[PDB]
RNA sequence: AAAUUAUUUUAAUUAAAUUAAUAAAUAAUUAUUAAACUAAUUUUAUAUUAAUAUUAUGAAAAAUUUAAAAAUUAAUUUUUU
C-alpha cells in the first residue's frame, strides 16, 4: 500500500484546522525584512517551506519513501544510491553536532570574545559601536547642560526637485530665468590629460 | 553535498549460505502472500537491536516480541526467517535471566530450522 | 561589450542583492553568545533583533513551530543543580574505557556476548538501513 | 542543473576551467607585485614584498630552503629547554626556595589587561602573579604570601610595593626570609611596577581622550564630532549664501504667492483704477 | 584517431545520395550529424522540449481562467507536488481531475502545514528507577507510536478488527513466546 | 531609480539607528540623581516576591572583589555583555515599565552602559550610583 | 469507503467503484497509470515475473472522482507485476570536440523494467464536506445543494467587457449528485 | 608559437552553445552571437471576475488566497471533500455527463433564429462523443496514426533490418529524436 | 516581569548555517580559499559551521557569497529532536573520528597515505588477531608440556 | 524572481534525519553511536527475505569481463594447471610493450 | 614547411626572471616516477617536495600606466570534453 510519513517519526501536524473553525494560512509573504517591496513566495520558497529542498526530489518525501515493494509487503533492498544518501544525512548531523562541540567547548573557557565582530570587520561597518568602556565615544560629555539636540531634517534637506523648465510662455521670465551657463556646448569630452 | 556511492566489487549480491541439498539439520546434529506490513517492522526489529547493542534489553524484548508476532502471521511454517526472529528473541530473554523461555524458544527454532528442506 | 543597458528586472534583482549582504552583515555582528537563564524558559520569545517584519505568526502553517514548541514550552532542566539530576542518568554505550556493569538492575552486558566483531543481524531493507561494514571505526 | 559524469563535473555550460582548484595560492614565483606569496591578509605591507624567486623558493619548501626557518621556534641559544631554578641546594628543606623565579620580565612584554587600579591591597594582585608561578605555588598559598606582606610590612597598596621596592625588601630580609620565597618578591615587584605603568597609560588614555584624541580600542585614530554645546546651524557665523541675494520679491521669478485682493504693482494696469 | 566507422559504416544506410555511396564523406557527414544531435540532446533539447509541455499546460490552464503564472505558483503552495509533465498528461488526457486541481489551488483551502521537526518525548526528562522487569517510559512510547502505525498500513490479516485494530495486547506479544 | 521601489526610509535612512539621541538622554539621567528612596523602591522590587534582581554593576572583576555588592543576588554583568546585546535574553519584558539601574566604578562607566540599554529599547534608568547602593545595603 | 459522516459514504461511495487512473511516482518518474496499463519504468531491482505494489501515488481518479493528494496518498494501493527487464533501445552518444584527435562512442543503454499494473484500488477516508471558496470543515453535506453557489460576472458597470454569444453567459452547474 | 597545456583551451577551441553566449565574462563571445530563442513563451494572465465580495477579492499577495481566481463556471459541481491524509477528495461530473450538459446549452444556443449548417455538425460530433469518445485531439491522433504503423512493423516483421544490434540501432534511436 | 531576570547564567553560542548563493568561479583565489574553509565549493552547497571567532572572519570576507542563518544553541537542540540535558561534547563524544572524509591532510597524498594505514590498521587488527589465537595456544602448549613431566 | 529571501535553516531540512537517526536511542538516555560512516562503507545489496532473491540483472562491472587466464599464485597454489606455454606469462612487473 | 597509425579515459595548474654578434640551452612552469604527516585554532581547511624529462619570452573584459600612438607596452584573475 502506498505511505505518507513525511518524517522521521511519522505524525503529521493536523492538516484540518478545526471542525468549523477558520483553517489558519500561512504566511504568503516572502521573509526579505524591508517590508517595503513586499514580494511572494515563488514556488521555491513555496517548496522550501513544504520540507523538500529547492527541488521536487531532494530530502522531500519524494526521496525518503521507498520506490515500490513487493505486493506482499517484503520491503525493498538499500539502493547503492540510498545508503550514500543515509551518509549524506548523518554528514549534515555530525556537521551539527560537531560545530557545536566545538562551541560548547568555548564557552568554557572563555574563549568567546565579549566584542561581536572580528577585527577587521569592526573597522569596515561603523554600526558596531566603538567599545571603549569608561571614556565617551564622541571624546568629552556634554558637559554643557543638553537641556543640545542637532536635528539632520532641519537643515539636511534631501528634496527631489522638479528642474522646471524656462518658462516661454511668458516673455519676462523667460529673459530672468536665461542661466547664462546655456554655454555649456563646450561639454565636448574634450582631452582631459592632453591637447 | 550528496555524492552518489561509488561501484565497487566489495558491494556483490552473494548469496545466502544454504547447507546444501541431500542434508538436513539434525542429520548432523543427532550424530555429535498476505500483505503484512513488513516495511514497518524491519524498521522495528532493527530498533531491537540498537536496544539489545545498547543494554536495554528488556525493551528490546517488547519489540522483539511484536517481530515475532508479525513474522509469524507473514510467512508460513518452518520459514527461516520466521526462524530468525525466534531466535534473536531467544537471546533476548537470556539478557534478562529469562533462561526458562530463552532455550524453549531457542531450541524451537532447531525444530523450525531442520523441518525445511 | 556592454552595449545595450542592463534590462531593468536585472538591476532590481541585483537591488534585492546587496538588500541580502546588508541581511548577512546583520548577523555576522550578533554577540558570540547570549547570556541565558536556566529557570526562564528557552526561548520565550527570545527571536534575535529580527521583528522588523516579523512573520508566520501562526504556531501552524508557520515553519519553526516544529522548535519553538518545544522552546517557548517549559524548560525542564530548570536549574544547574536539576542538570545533574538528569545527566546522571545517561549511559555511553560504545565509548572507550571500563563501566560498572552491575549499575543496572539484572542486565548483562552484550558486547561481552557476542564478542567485539560480531553485530546484530540487523534487517536491512530500504527504511532501515543499519551501519554497514563495521570493521572500519576502530581509529 | 547541467552536472555530467563526476565530482567537480558541475555545472559544465560557463566555460570556466573546472578541476582547477581555485582555492590554492598563485604560484607568483618571478613576478614584481605587492600581492606576492603574501596570505591576503598582509597585502597592506608594501614596505617587504615578498616577490622573487628565493621568496617563491622559501616560502614553499623548495630547492634549498627545504626545512626553510633555519631556526624556528622550539630552540633556546640561551637556556636550552632547562628551566633555570637551583635544585642543588645546601639544605633539602630549603629546596624548595628557588623555585618561582623571574626569568625574565613575564608581565610588561605580554601586556595583560590589570584592571586593577594601583589603590588596591596587594592581595589583588596575586591572581596575575599566579600564573606565571604555578607549579611553584599552590594559589591558595600565594594568599598566605601576599597576605603576610600586608600585615607584616607597612606597604599595603600596588601603588606602594611600586614606590617601596626598597623599604619593602629591608623588610623581608629582617622578617620573612623563612616563609615567603623571595620569588614572590622578585614577581610581587614586577607586577606592581607594571600594574602602576600600565594604570599611568590608561589614565593617560583618558585624559586625551576629552582633549579629543579619540582612538579605538584597537588604538587606531577615528575621527568624530565633539558634543553640542550650541545652536547648531551657525547664526552670526553663517557665511553669507553665496548666490546673488537677489530676492524672489525683486524679480518675481517664480515661487511666490500673493492673495488675489492683495495683488501688488500695477500702477499702470490695474492699480490705476485700485478697485 | 578511430572514427568508430564500424559502428557507423552500417548506419549510413539511411543518409542521402552523395553520403551512402561514398565513405569518407558518409561518415564525415554522419559523424557530424551525430556529434550535433548528443550535443543538441544534451544541452538544447529540454529547455525547448520542456517549453512544450509548459506551452500546452498553461494554455490548458487558460481555458480555465488561469495562467501558467499563477497556476505554477498555487501548485507548491498546496504542496502538491506534480511535475510538469505530469500535468501534461492531465491537461490532455484527464481534463476534469486537471481542473480538480485548478479548482484546488483557486480555492481558499488552508495548505498542508510544513512537517514538524523531530519532537523530544518527555519520558526522556524522568529517571526510571532501573528495574529488571519494567521497560524504560520512552521505549513503550515509542513502541505504542510504532505498533499503532503498523496497523495502519494497509488491509491484513493482523488481528483484523474492524477500523482500529487491538493494540494493549499487541504491544505484549513477547509474553506469548514466554514459558 | 530607487525609492520609488523602496520607501523613503531608505536612500534618505540614517541606518545609525544606534544611538543619535539616547546617548544625550544617557547624560540627563547621569545628572538628576540616585539615592536611598530610590534604592528603596528598587528594595520593595526585592520586597516583591519575584526575585528578579533589578541593579546591575558593570564593573572590572578585581573591583567588585574589593567592594562586593552582590549580597541582593543583584546581576553582574561585563559591560560588554551589555553593549553587544547578549544581555537581552535576560532583560524584563516592559521595556516601558522597568527600570532598572546599573551600578559602575566610575559614573562614566555607568552611563556608558545605561546609553547601550536605551538603545536596546529600554526608556527608564537613571543609571548610577556606586555608593548609595552599598550604604542601602539590601 | 469509510467517513465519519453517515450520509457523506452513502453518496460519495457509489463514485469510487469504476476503473481509476493514479499518478505514480516511480524511479523519480510520474506516470499516469491505468489498471491493465503497462509503463516502463527505470530498472527497480525485482526479479521477473514478481508483484510490486508502487508506494508514492500523488492523484487517483475515477471516472467521475478525482483525489488529489497533497503531497502524497496512504491508503491507496496500485500494484504491478514485472514482465521485462531490460535495456531498451540504446541512443549513442559521439562525443568528441572538433579540436582534439579523439573519439568516443558512448552507447547509453538505459536499464527499464516494464511494469503491468493490475491492482488499483482507493480505500479514502472523508472527514466532511469542504467549502471551496472559503475553506472550513461544513458540518453538514446535502448532496443536492452546491455550498459554492455562483452568479454572473457581468456588473454590467464597464462597455468594454467581452460578452460572450449570449447562450454561455447565462448558464447553469446542472446538480449532479441527485 | 608556446604550445604549452594551460595556455589557452585544452586542445584547440571549440564554441558550443554554452561558449557562444556566456563566454568568459558571460557577456558572451564577440563572433558567433547566439540564436534567437524560438521557444514558445506563456502567455499572460487573464483578468480576474469582479469583485462583489467585499472580502478583499482584489488582494493579489495574501495569504488566505491562491493567486489564480478561477470562479469560472460549472465549478460548483466540483465540490470538493476533505480526505484524512489531508488530500482532497473533488467530485466531478464525468467527462460525459459534462458534454451531454454541453449539448442542451449549445442546442438552445442556435435554435432560437436557426441552427446553422455548421451548428448541426457540433451537435453532432458533441453527440459523437458521448456515444462512442470520437476523440478530437491532436496527442492522441498524433499517437495512434503512428503507433499503429509502428506495431504493424512488428507483427508483420516488415523490417528488412534484422540485424540492428545496438550499435547499428545506436545511431538510429537518436537521428529520429522524439 | 520589570525585573532582570535572575538566576544562574549559562551562555549559549550560535550556529551559522550556510549556503551558496554566487558561483564560486567567479570570484578571487582567496575568497574561493574561504568558502573552501567553509566546506563550500559549489552553488548550491550548505554546511553547518560554528559562530567561533575565526569563523566570523572566514564568514565576513564571503558575506556577497554566501547566505547565512544564525542559531542559538538552544534552538539547535531542538531542530534535531535532543534532549535539554544532553550536551554536544558529548554526543560527539560518541561519533567515531573517522567519519566520511576523516581529515584533510596537507595534500592528497598524505590524504592517501592516511587513507592507506587506516586500511592497514584493518589488516592488523585481524592480524593481531589471528596470532592472539596462537600466544594463547603456545602459552598453553608449552604448560601441557611442562606439567606433562609432573 | 532569482534572489529567493529564506530561512536557509529550510534547505537542509532535518525532517527525516534527527539525532534518532544516528542516535537511535537517545530517548532512552544510553546514548548509543550507530552511524552510516561513508558511502564507501556499503556492503552491498542483502536480500531482506530469502523468497525474494534479488535479481541478476547485470552491469558493465559483470557482463563485461574476460576469462580467467592463470595468475602465478594459481599456477603456485596448484601446479596442476599450467598445461601449456601460453600459461607461462611474463613476470607481472612487465605491463607489456610500449 | 607536410605528416607521425591503435574510442569508451579516472587526480589539478601555466609561467614571464639571469642571458642571447637573438634563441636547441636557465629559472618558473608542465611532465614522468617517488616522497614525509611540526604549535597556531574549528573535531575547519589545506598539491608542499625530491629525482629526472623539457627547441617558450609576452597575459581576454576589467582597474590603471607609459606612448603623436593611429596599438604596442607594461600590468593581473580569467583561459570550456
Same mark, same amino acid.
Given at each position: ?91 549534515? =548531523? ?43 565615544? *564622541? ?40 542661466? *547664462? ?15 | ?12 549480491? $552473494? ?98 530450522? !531442520?523441518?525445511?528442506? | ?33 547570549? #547570556? ?44 544547574? /543543580? ?56 576502530? #581509529? | ?28 614565483? &618571478? ?97 596575575? #602573579? ?64 607594571? #600594574? ?58 517664480? !515661487? ?20 | ?16 545520395? $552523395?553520403? $551512402? ?159 | ?138 | ?104 562512442? =558512448? ?26 471558496? !472559503? ?40 446538480? /449532479?449528485?441527485? | ?93 464525468? &467527462? ?83 | ?71 542559538? =544553541? ?13 550536551? *554536544? ?62 | 524572481?532569482?534572489?529567493? *529571501? ?29 552511524? $552510516? ?11 531482506? !527475505? ?49
Amino acid at each position: 500500500y502506498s505511505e505518507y510519513r513525511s518524517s522521521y517519526t511519522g505524525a503529521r501536524s493536523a492538516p484540518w484546522a478545526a471542525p468549523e473553525a477558520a483553517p489558519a494560512y500561512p504566511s504568503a509573504r516572502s521573509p526579505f525584512p524591508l517590508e517595503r517591496p513586499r514580494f511572494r513566495k515563488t514556488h521555491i520558497e513555496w517548496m522550501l517551506h513544504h520540507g523538500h529542498g529547492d527541488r521536487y526530489g531532494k530530502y522531500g518525501p519524494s526521496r525518503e519513501i521507498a520506490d515500490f515493494e513487493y505486493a506482499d509487503g517484503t520491503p525493498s533492498s538499500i539502493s547503492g544510491k540510498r545508503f550514500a544518501l543515509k551518509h549524506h544525512q548523518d554528514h549534515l =548531523l555530525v556537521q551539527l553536532i560537531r560545530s557545536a562541540a566545538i562551541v560548547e567547548r568555548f564557552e568554557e573557557e572563555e574563549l568567546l570574545p565579549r566584542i561581536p565582530g572580528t577585527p577587521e570587520q569592526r573597522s569596515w561597518d561603523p554600526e558596531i559601536p566603538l567599545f571603549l568602556e569608561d571614556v565617551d565615544e *564622541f571624546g568629552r560629555p556634554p558637559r554643557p547642560v543638553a537641556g543640545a539636540t542637532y536635528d539632520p531634517a532641519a537643515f539636511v534637506s534631501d528634496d527631489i526637485k522638479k528642474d522646471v523648465r524656462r518658462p516661454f510662455w511668458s516673455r519676462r521670465r523667460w529673459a530672468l530665468s536665461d542661466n *547664462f551657463m546655456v554655454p555649456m556646448s563646450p561639454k565636448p569630452k574634450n582631452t582631459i590629460k592632453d591637447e | 553535498s550528496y555524492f552518489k556511492g561509488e561501484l565497487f566489487p566489495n558491494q556483490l549480491a $552473494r548469496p545466502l549460505e544454504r547447507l546444501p541439498r541431500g542434508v538436513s539439520l539434525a542429520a548432523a546434529r543427532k550424530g555429535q502472500r498476505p500483505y503484512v506490513p513488513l516495511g514497518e517492522v524491519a524498521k522495528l526489529e532493527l530498533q531491537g537491536d540498537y536496544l539489545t547493542e545498547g543494554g536495554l534489553h528488556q525493551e528490546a524484548l517488547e519489540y522483539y516480541g511484536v517481530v515475532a508476532k508479525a513474522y509469524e502471521l507473514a510467512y508460513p511454517k518452518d520459514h527461516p526467517q520466521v526462524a530468525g526472529i525466534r531466535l534473536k528473541l531467544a537471546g533476548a530473554f537470556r539478557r534478562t535471566g529469562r533462561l526458562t523461555s530463552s532455550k524453549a524458544n531457542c531450541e524451537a527454532v532447531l525444530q523450525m530450522l !531442520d523441518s525445511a528442506v | 561589450e556592454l552595449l545595450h543597458p542592463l534590462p531593468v528586472w536585472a538591476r532590481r534583482q541585483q537591488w534585492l542583492k546587496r538588500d541580502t549582504v546588508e541581511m548577512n552583515e546583520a548577523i555576522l555582528r550578533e554577540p558570540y553568545y547570549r #547570556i541565558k537563564t536556566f529557570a526562564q524558559p528557552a526561548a520565550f520569545v527570545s527571536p534575535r533583533v529580527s521583528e522588523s517584519a516579523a512573520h508566520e505568526p501562526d504556531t501552524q502553517q508557520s515553519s519553526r513551530y516544529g522548535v519553538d514548541r518545544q522552546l517557548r514550552g517549559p524548560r525542564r532542566a530548570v536549574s544547574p /543543580e536539576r542538570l545533574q539530576e538528569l545527566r546522571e542518568q545517561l549511559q555511553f554505550v560504545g565509548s572507550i574505557g571500563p563501566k560498572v556493569p552491575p549499575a543496572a538492575g539484572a542486565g548483562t552486558a552484550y558486547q561481552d556476548e557476542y564478542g567485539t566483531r560480531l553485530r546484530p543481524r540487523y534487517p536491512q531493507s530500504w527504511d532501515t538501513v543499519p551501519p554497514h561494514q563495521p570493521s572500519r571505526s576502530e #581509529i | 542543473a547541467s552536472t555530467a559524469k563526476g565530482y567537480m563535473n558541475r555545472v559544465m555550460v560557463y566555460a570556466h576551467r573546472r578541476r582547477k582548484a581555485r582555492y590554492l595560492a598563485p604560484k607568483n614565483a &618571478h613576478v614584481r607585485s605587492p600581492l606576492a606569496h603574501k596570505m591576503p591578509e598582509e597585502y597592506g605591507n608594501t614596505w617587504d614584498p615578498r616577490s622573487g624567486v628565493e621568496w617563491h623558493n622559501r616560502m614553499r619548501n623548495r630547492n634549498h630552503y627545504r626545512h626553510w626557518p633555519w631556526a624556528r621556534w622550539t630552540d633556546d641559544p640561551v637556556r636550552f629547554h632547562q628551566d633555570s631554578v637551583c635544585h642543588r641546594t645546601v639544605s633539602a628543606l630549603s629546596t624548595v626556595a628557588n623555585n618561582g623565579a623571574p626569568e625574565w620580565d613575564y608581565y610588561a612584554e605580554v601586556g595583560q589587561a590589570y584592571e586593577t587600579p594601583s589603590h588596591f591591597p596587594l592581595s589583588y594582585t596575586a591572581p596575575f #602573579i599566579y600564573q606565571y608561578t604555578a607549579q611553584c605555588w599552590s594559589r591558595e598559598d600565594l594568599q598566605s604570601y601576599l597576605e603576610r606582606i600586608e600585615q607584616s610590612s607597612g606597604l599595603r597598596t600596588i601603588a606602594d610595593a611600586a614606590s617601596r621596592r626598597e623599604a619593602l625588601y629591608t623588610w623581608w630580609h629582617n622578617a620573612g626570609m623563612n616563609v615567603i620565597p623571595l620569588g614572590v618578591l622578585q614577581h610581587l615587584e614586577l607586577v606592581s611596577r607594571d #600594574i602602576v605603568a600600565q594604570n599611568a597609560r590608561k589614565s593617560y588614555r583618558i585624559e586625551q581622550h576629552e582633549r579629543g584624541i579619540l582612538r579605538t580600542p584597537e588604538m587606531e585614530r577615528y575621527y568624530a564630532l565633539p558634543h553640542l554645546r550650541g545652536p547648531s546651524m551657525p547664526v552670526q557665523l553663517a557665511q553669507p549664501s553665496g548666490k546673488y541675494p537677489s530676492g524672489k520679491f525683486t524679480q518675481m521669478m517664480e !515661487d511666490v504667492a500673493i492673495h488675489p485682493l492683495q495683488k501688488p504693482d500695477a500702477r499702470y494696469k490695474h492699480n490705476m483704477y485700485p478697485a | 584517431y578511430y572514427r568508430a566507422t564500424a559502428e557507423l559504416d552500417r548506419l549510413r544506410g539511411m543518409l542521402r545520395g $552523395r553520403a $551512402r555511396l561514398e565513405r569518407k564523406v558518409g561518415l564525415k557527414r554522419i559523424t557530424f550529424l551525430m556529434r550535433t544531435q548528443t550535443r543538441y540532446r544534451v544541452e538544447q533539447k529540454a529547455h525547448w522540449e520542456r517549453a512544450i509541455v509548459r506551452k500546452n499546460v498553461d494554455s490548458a490552464a487558460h481555458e480555465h481562467g488561469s495562467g501558467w503564472q499563477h497556476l505554477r505558483n498555487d501548485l507548491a503552495r498546496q504542496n502538491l507536488m506534480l511535475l510538469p509533465r505530469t500535468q501534461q498528461q492531465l491537461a490532455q488526457y484527464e481534463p476534469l481531475a486537471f481542473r480538480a486541481v485548478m479548482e484546488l489551488c483557486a480555492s481558499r483551502v488552508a495548505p498542508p502545514p510544513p512537517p514538524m521537526t523531530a519532537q523530544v518525548p518527555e519520558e526522556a526528562y524522568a529517571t526510571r528507577p532501573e528495574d529488571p522487569k519494567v521497560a524504560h517510559p520512552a521505549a513503550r512510547r515509542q513502541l505504542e507510536e510504532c505498533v499503532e502505525r503498523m496497523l495502519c498500513t494497509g488491509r491484513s490479516d493482523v488481528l483484523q478488527r474492524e477500523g482500529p485494530r487491538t493494540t494493549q495486547a499487541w504491544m505484549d506479544a513477547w509474553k506469548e513466546y514466554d514459558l | 531609480n530607487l525609492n520609488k521601489r523602496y520607501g523613503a526610509p531608505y536612500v534618505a535612512k540614517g541606518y545609525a539607528s544606534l544611538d543619535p539621541r539616547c546617548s544625550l538622554d544617557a547624560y540627563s539621567s547621569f545628572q538628576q540623581t540616585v539615592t536611598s528612596a530610590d534604592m528603596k523602591k528598587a528594595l520593595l522590587s526585592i520586597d516583591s516576591t519575584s526575585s528578579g534582581a533589578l541593579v546591575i554593576d558593570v564593573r572590572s572583576e578585581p573591583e567588585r572583589r574589593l567592594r562586593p555588592l552582590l549580597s541582593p543576588a543583584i546581576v553582574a554583568l561585563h559591560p560588554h555583555d551589555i553593549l553587544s546585546g547578549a544581555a537581552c535574553p535576560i532583560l524584563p519584558s516592559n521595556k516601558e515599565r522597568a527600570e532598572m539601574f546599573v551600578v559602575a566604578s566610575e559614573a562614566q562607566r555607568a552611563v556608558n552602559a545605561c546609553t547601550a540599554l536605551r538603545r536596546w529599547g529600554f526608556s527608564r534608568v537613571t543609571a548610577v550610583s556606586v555608593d548609595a547602593v552599598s550604604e542601602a545595603i539590601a | 469507503l469509510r467517513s465519519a459522516n453517515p450520509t457523506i459514504a452513502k453518496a460519495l461511495q457509489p463514485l469510487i467503484e469504476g476503473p481509476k487512473f493514479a499518478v505514480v511516482y516511480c524511479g523519480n518518474h510520474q506516470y499516469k497509470v491505468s489498471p491493465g496499463d503497462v509503463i516502463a519504468v527505470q530498472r527497480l531491482r525485482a526479479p521477473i515475473g514478481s508483484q510490486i505494489a508502487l508506494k508514492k501515488v500523488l492523484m487517483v481518479g475515477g471516472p467521475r472522482f478525482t483525489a488529489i493528494g497533497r503531497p502524497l496518498l496512504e491508503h491507496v494501493r496500485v500494484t504491478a507485476d514485472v514482465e521485462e527487464q531490460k535495456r531498451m533501445r540504446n541512443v549513442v552518444s559521439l562525443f568528441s570536440t572538433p579540436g582534439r584527435r579523439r573519439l568516443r562512442w =558512448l552507447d547509453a543503454q538505459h536499464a527499464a523494467t516494464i511494469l503491468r499494473i493490475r491492482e488499483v484500488v482507493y480505500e479514502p477516508t472523508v472527514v466532511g464536506e469542504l467549502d471551496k471558496y !472559503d475553506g472550513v470543515l461544513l458540518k453538514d453535506f446535502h448532496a443536492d445543494r452546491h455550498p459554492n453557489p455562483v452568479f454572473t460576472a457581468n456588473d454590467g458597470y464597464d462597455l468594454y467587457y467581452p460578452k460572450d454569444w449570449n447562450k454561455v453567459e447565462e448558464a447553469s452547474a446542472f446538480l /449532479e449528485m441527485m | 608559437r608556446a604550445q604549452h597545456p594551460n595556455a589557452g583551451t585544452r586542445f584547440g577551441r571549440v564554441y558550443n552553445r554554452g561558449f557562444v553566449r556566456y563566454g568568459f565574462g558571460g557577456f558572451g563571445m564577440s563572433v558567433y552571437s547566439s540564436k534567437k530563442d524560438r521557444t514558445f513563451k506563456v502567455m499572460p494572465v487573464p483578468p480576474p471576475p469582479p469583485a462583489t465580495t467585499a472580502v478583499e477579492q482584489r488582494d493579489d499577495f495574501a495569504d488566505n488566497r491562491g493567486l489564480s481566481a478561477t470562479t469560472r463556471t460549472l465549478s460548483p459541481t466540483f465540490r470538493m471533500f476533505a480526505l484524512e491524509d489531508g488530500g482532497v477528495l473533488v467530485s466531478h461530473p464525468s &467527462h460525459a455527463q459534462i458534454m451531454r450538459w454541453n449539448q442542451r446549452v449549445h442546442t438552445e444556443e442556435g435554435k432560437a433564429a436557426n441552427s446553422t449548417v455548421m451548428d448541426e455538425y457540433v451537435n453532432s460530433r458533441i453527440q459523437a462523443i458521448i456515444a462512442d469518445n470520437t476523440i478530437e485531439n491532436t496527442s492522441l491522433s498524433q499517437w495512434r496514426k503512428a503507433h499503429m504503423w509502428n506495431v504493424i512493423k512488428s507483427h508483420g516483421k516488415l523490417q528488412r533490418r534484422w540485424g540492428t544490434p545496438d550499435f547499428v540501432m545506436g545511431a538510429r534511436s537518436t537521428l529520429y529524436n522524439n | 516581569t520589570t525585573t532582570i531576570a535572575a538566576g544562574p547564567y549559562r551562555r549559549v553560542g550560535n550556529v551559522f548555517i550556510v549556503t551558496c548563493i554566487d558561483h564560486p568561479f567567479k570570484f578571487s583565489w582567496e575568497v574561493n580559499r574561504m568558502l573552501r574553509e567553509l566546506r563550500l565549493e559549489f552553488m548550491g552547497q550548505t554546511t553547518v559551521v560554528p559562530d567561533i571567532p575565526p569563523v566570523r572572519k572566514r564568514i565576513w570576507r564571503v558575506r556577497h557569497v554566501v547566505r547565512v542563518d544564525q542559531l542559538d =544553541l538552544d534552538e539547535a537542540k531542538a531542530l534535531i529532536g535532543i534532549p535539554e540535558h544532553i550536551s *554536544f561534547r558529548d554526543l560527539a563524544g560518541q561519533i567515531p573520528p573517522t567519519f566520511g572524509r576523516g581529515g584533510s591532510v596537507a595534500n592528497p597524498h598524505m590524504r592517501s597515505k592516511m587513507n592507506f594505514m587506516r586500511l592497514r590498521r584493518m589488516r592488523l587488527r585481524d592480524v593481531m588477531h589471528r596470532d592472539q589465537l596462537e600466544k594463547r595456544l603456545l602459552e598453553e602448549r608449552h604448560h601441557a608440556l611442562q606439567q606433562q613431566q609432573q | 524572481r532569482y534572489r529567493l *529571501f529564506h530561512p536557509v535553516h529550510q534547505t537542509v531540512p532535518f525532517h527525516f534525519n534527527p539525532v534518532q537517526s544516528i542516535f537511535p536511542l537517545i530517548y532512552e538516555n544510553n546514548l548509543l553511536a550507530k552511524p $552510516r560512516l561513508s558511502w564507501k562503507d556499503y556492503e552491498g545489496r542483502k536480500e531482506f !527475505d530469502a523468497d525474494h532473491p534479488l535479481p541478476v540483472v547485470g552491469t558493465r562491472l559483470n557482463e563485461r569481463t574476460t576469462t580467467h587466464k592463470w595468475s602465478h599464485w594459481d599456477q603456485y597454489i596448484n601446479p596442476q594447471i599450467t598445461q601449456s606455454w601460453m600459461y607461462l606469462t611474463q613476470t607481472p612487473e612487465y605491463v607489456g610493450p610500449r
